[PDB]
Amino acid sequence: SMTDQQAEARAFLSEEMIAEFKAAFDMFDADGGGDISTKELGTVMRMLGQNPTKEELDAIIEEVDEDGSGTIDFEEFLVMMVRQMKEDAKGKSEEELEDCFRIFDKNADGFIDIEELGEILRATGEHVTEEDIEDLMKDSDKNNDGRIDFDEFLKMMEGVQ
Numbered sequence: 104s105m106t107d108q109q110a111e112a113r114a115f116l117s118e119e120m121i122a123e124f125k126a127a128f129d130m131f132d133a134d135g136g137g138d139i140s141t142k143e144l145g146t147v148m149r150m151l152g153q154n155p156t157k158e159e160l161d162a163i164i165e166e167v168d169e170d171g172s173g174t175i176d177f178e179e180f181l182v183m184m185v186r187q188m189k190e191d192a193k194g195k196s197e198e199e200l201e202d203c204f205r206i207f208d209k210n211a212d213g214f215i216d217i218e219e220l221g222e223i224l225r226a227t228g229e230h231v232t233e234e235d236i237e238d239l240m241k242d243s244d245k246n247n248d249g250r251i252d253f254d255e256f257l258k259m260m261e262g263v264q
């Protein structure tokens with residue numbers, strides 16, 4: 104069901120981006136065979152802005168090099184590329200979210216209180232009323248303590264996963 108994975112890897116990407124990826128890829132494919140040595144996988148990934156740990160690179164080669172060819176074809180390469188891209192993106196957002204919280208928690212007590220919540224909303228310039236701010240608090244405040252912890256904040260920001 105790799106061919107399934109392969110088809111889903113291509114659908115995630117736009118054709119121009121896929122061709123750009125190939126253009127980089129083809130730089131390490133001499134014989135014009137459509138595959139590179141798994142030795143160059145990390146390199147190509149990195150030039151195209153992915154940052155796989157050595158351990159994840161080792162897992163991938165392991166997955167693709169089941170026959171001992173010592174090579175990975177462009178299709179299994181887009182598959183690995185999308186896995187990496189998703190793994191990386193998610194990661195970025197976790198971090199920005201963390202930053203966000205630290206910024207919103209103006210007294211750094213570990214919670215966003217109704218006063219802090221109001222000030223940040225009101226600063227958007229949006230025409231939100233008190234009733235509106237207190238509605239978002241109740242809805243997000245899961246243990247009914249009147250404040251939002253990091254835990255409720257993630258739930259708040261990311262909705263229903």
Ligand SMILES: [Ca+2]
Binds near residue numbers: 208
């Ligand atoms: Ca606070």
Ligand SMILES: [Ca+2]
Binds near residue numbers: 244245246249
């Ligand atoms: Ca709470």
